[PDB]
Each structure stands twice: as C-alpha cells, then as structure tokens.
C-alpha cells in the first residue's frame, strides 16, 4: 500500500511516460508522468539511432571473394585482405554497441536523478529525503499543491511556517 | 523478383536499415557492412528493475 521511489525498484504501472511522480495525500493516492524528462531521454536515444546509420556504405565492383580453383599467392592475398576487413569491422561493431549501451544506461539514470534534484530544489526546507526516492512533505499538500510541484510553480514560502513547525 | 532493394547479395536482396549484416560478404549497392556476429542488440530503453512487493 505504501508508495516507494526509484531507489528500490521501477514502476510497472507507469505507461504514459518514462519518469513520473507518485503521491499520497489527504485526498488519496495518485500517479503522473513527467513528460519533459521522458522526452529528454528519448531525444538522445533517437539521436544514437540516427548516428549509427548516418554514414552510407555503398560498394559496387570490388574484389572476388569466393574462388573455384586453387591458385596460390594472389588468391592467398585476396582472401587475407577480405578476412582482415571483416575482423576489423566486427570489432568496431562489438565495441560500438558496448559503448552505446553503457551510455544509454548512464543517460537514463541521469534523467531520473535530475528530476529528483529538481524536485529537491523546489521543496527546500519543507520536505526531507526519506531515502527511498520519496520526499516527506511536512505540510498539508492537496492535489492542487502536488500539481504545483509537478509543473514547477510550487511556492515554498506559502507552506514554510507550517512545514518548519512540523519538522521540529 | 519484382521488388525494390538497394542491396543485393548472392543470397538475395537485403534491406539496409541496420548498420551491419551477416548474410554474405559478397554485396552490391548500398549495403550494411558485413560482420561475423549473428546478432548485436542496441539498448533503446533504461535498466529494467521490476518492482518490489
């Protein structure tokens, strides 16, 4: 029943975005996706997909690569040239997806932390980090108050006196 | 056959939406580059951390 953030797990119920908010207040529990940080991560992954095919490989008349007869020296060199090429490109492909996947995991992890810190900044001295990805907001925060946090218009001076009294 | 494909191999035409290819080192046209791997999976999403009870 109690809600928990990203430190512990992910949310299978979230389908309208990649990152989002869950809250529990006097009116009940709710969920909402954060679209800007969802698209900020998607924009980067789209950019990767664009850069991996951005260069066209267009080859026409090349060398012969299969042979029906034993010839010796020249054919040895033709086979060696093609095998060398394939091994180098096979290496380039293996390193590329490894580097890209490491960066994709990093950038998506970063978008989560940026949304958490962005929220931490808004709340200032009116909330505390519970340590599981959630904030304990020390004042009455109705649905309209939660939405002000989600859309970045929350004014901390309004609830500051109330929140400081509950914290201490 | 009656179709459209920029890339031709002795095995037949192949599309070129992927950067690499494992069908045949003999190609003609705008083709993916030939590699030895049969599959390379590029992540298009974040780490999947299924939820707790």
């Amino acid at each position: 029943g109690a809600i928990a953030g990203f430190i512990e797990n992910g949310w299978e119920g979230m389908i309208d975005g990649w990152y989002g908010f869950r809250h529990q207040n006097s009116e009940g529990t709710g969920q909402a996706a954060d679209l800007k940080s969802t698209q900020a991560a998607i924009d980067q992954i789209n950019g990767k997909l664009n850069r991996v095919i951005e260069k066209t490989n267009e080859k026409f008349h090349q060398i012969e690569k299969e042979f029906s007869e034993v010839e010796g020296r020249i054919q040895d060199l033709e086979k060696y040239v093609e095998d060398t090429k394939i091994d180098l490109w096979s290496y380039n492909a293996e390193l590329l997806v490894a580097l890209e996947n490491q960066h994709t995991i990093d950038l998506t992890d970063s978008e989560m932390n940026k949304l958490f810190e962005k929220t931490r900044r808004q709340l200032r001295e009116n909330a505390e980090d519970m340590g599981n990805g959630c904030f304990k907001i020390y004042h009455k925060c109705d649905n309209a108050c939660i939405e002000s946090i989600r859309n970045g218009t929350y004014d901390h001076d309004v609830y500051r006196d109330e929140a400081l009294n509950n914290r201490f | 056959d009656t179709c459209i494909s920029e890339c031709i191999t002795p095995n037949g035409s192949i599309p070129n939406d992927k950067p690499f290819q494992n069908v045949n080192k003999i190609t003609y046209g705008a083709c993916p580059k030939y590699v030895k791997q049969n599959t390379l999976k590029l992540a298009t999403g974040m780490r999947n951390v299924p939820e707790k009870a």
């Epitope: 969802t38 698209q39 789209n46 664009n50 951005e54 | 920029e6 298009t44 999403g45």
Partner: antibody, heavy 128, light 108 residues
Framework: QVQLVQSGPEVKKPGASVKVSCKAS????????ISWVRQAPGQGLEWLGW????????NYAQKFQGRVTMTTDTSTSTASMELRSLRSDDTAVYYC?????????????????????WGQGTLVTVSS | DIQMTQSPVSLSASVGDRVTITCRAS??????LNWYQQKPGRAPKLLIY???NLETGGPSRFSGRGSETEFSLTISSLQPEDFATYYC?????????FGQGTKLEIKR
C-alpha cells in the same frame, strides 16, 4: 482520415499580430508535433518552427526568433502560431503540418520527421 | 542552414514519359529527405518520406533514391495527375529547409 483544419483567413495592418490555429483529428495529438510552413504568393516554402504536442518544447527558425510564439493545447487538440510585428513581406499562405513522433523511441524510417498531413492553409495578407 | 538545390528548375514532358528530378544538399543529411507535390492552388502533399518510402496511399510510379548529399525522384510513366511542382525538403537538422521546387509541365 487524419486531418488538420486551420482557422480562416486574416487581413492585418503592419505592426499588428496574427494568431493562426490548427485543429487535429484522426490521430493522437499529444504523441506528435506541429511544424509551421508559409508560402508567399508565387514563392517557395519556408519553415517557421515546430512545437511538440508531448512536451510543449519549441524550435524556431533564427529568422523569426522574438516574433513567433507557438502554443499547444492537449484538451482541444489545437496548435497555435502567433507572429508579431507583421510586415508586408509576411504576406503568405500559412500551413501547419503534423511532424515528429513523440513519447517513444523511433527508428529513422518510423520517426515521422516529415510533414504529413498538412492543413488546408491560412491566407494572411499584411498591407497598409 | 543547409541548402537544398533542385534540378531542373522546370521540365516539360509527355504523358507516359519517364522523368527524374534531382535534389542536392550542401552537407550530409542521411536519408532524412522528403518530397512534396503541390498542385496549383492546393496545399502541398507528402509523396516520398525518408528518401525512398512511398506514403501508404501513394502511386507506385513514383520512386525515390539517394542518401547523404545526393537525391532523386523518378516518375516511371507520367500521368496527367503528375504535372505539378515538386519540392524536396531536409529534416535532418533544424532549421528544416526546402528546395526551390521543380515545375513539371506538359509538352505540346
């Protein structure tokens, strides 16, 4: 039929502002964006900018920075374009077009980085 | 900005003819090039997207080719409906830019 329907024609005196709206139907308006393109009479097509129906993010051509504001409204599925400080050479037929899929990773051949469909057009005449 | 150059500026051909329009970018745009057909007095309409893909409605006599810097549009057997103006357009970088158009008219 996926469709963009634009507001009626406008006649404006120099120095005024014009606001043109595009109403979408037949598709998920919040999962795409809208690009605005204008065409002066007997001329070619010129890109003004783009706004996302998902985020509200905007891209303006440097030529129009400070003069254009694009807005999107999810509930009415309507995108708007406002051009300020109009001049005589702002006279054109203004088009909107659905552009760029949002909210999901897309391969290039499925990115919808192309203008389709188009609105019917909005004629804006700027003359004193 | 990236510049798009279309050739020829104008072209006259007969019904059943085979024609080819050319579009050129000042720098590489990948395959993010689109083609639009505009009939006089009407809004532009998408014909080819991502260099070579026919919009699902589209007639099979239109075909697109090219990548990077050089692109083409081909009509294998010209029909009366095909005589209009054709614009190529680049979607790789903002700001998106159009070619100046190729007007296709009937020979007589």
């Amino acid at each position: 039929q996926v469709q963009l329907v634009q507001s009626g024609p406008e006649v404006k005196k120099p120095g005024a502002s014009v606001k043109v709206s595009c109403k979408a139907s037949g598709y998920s308006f919040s999962r795409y964006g809208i690009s605005w393109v204008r065409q002066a009479p007997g001329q070619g097509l010129e890109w003004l900018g783009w706004i996302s129906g998902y985020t509200g993010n905007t891209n303006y051509a440097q030529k129009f920075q400070g003069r254009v504001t694009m807005t999107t409204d999810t509930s009415t599925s309507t995108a708007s374009m406002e051009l300020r400080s109009l001049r005589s050479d702002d006279t054109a037929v203004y088009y909107c077009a659905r552009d760029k899929k949002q909210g999901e990773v897309v391969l290039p051949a499925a990115s919808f980085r192309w203008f389709a469909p188009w609105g019917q057009g909005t004629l804006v005449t700027v003359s004193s | 900005d990236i510049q798009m150059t279309q050739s020829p500026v104008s072209l006259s051909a007969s019904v059943g003819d085979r024609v080819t329009i050319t579009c050129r970018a000042s720098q590489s745009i990948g395959k993010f090039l689109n083609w639009y057909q505009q009939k006089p007095g009407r809004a532009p309409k998408l014909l080819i997207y991502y260099a070579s893909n026919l919009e699902t409605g589209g007639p099979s006599r239109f075909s697109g080719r090219g990548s990077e810097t050089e692109f083409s549009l081909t009509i294998s057997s010209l029909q009366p409906e095909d005589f209009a103006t054709y614009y190529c357009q680049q979607s790789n970088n903002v700001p998106h830019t159009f070619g100046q158009g190729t007007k296709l008219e009937i020979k007589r």
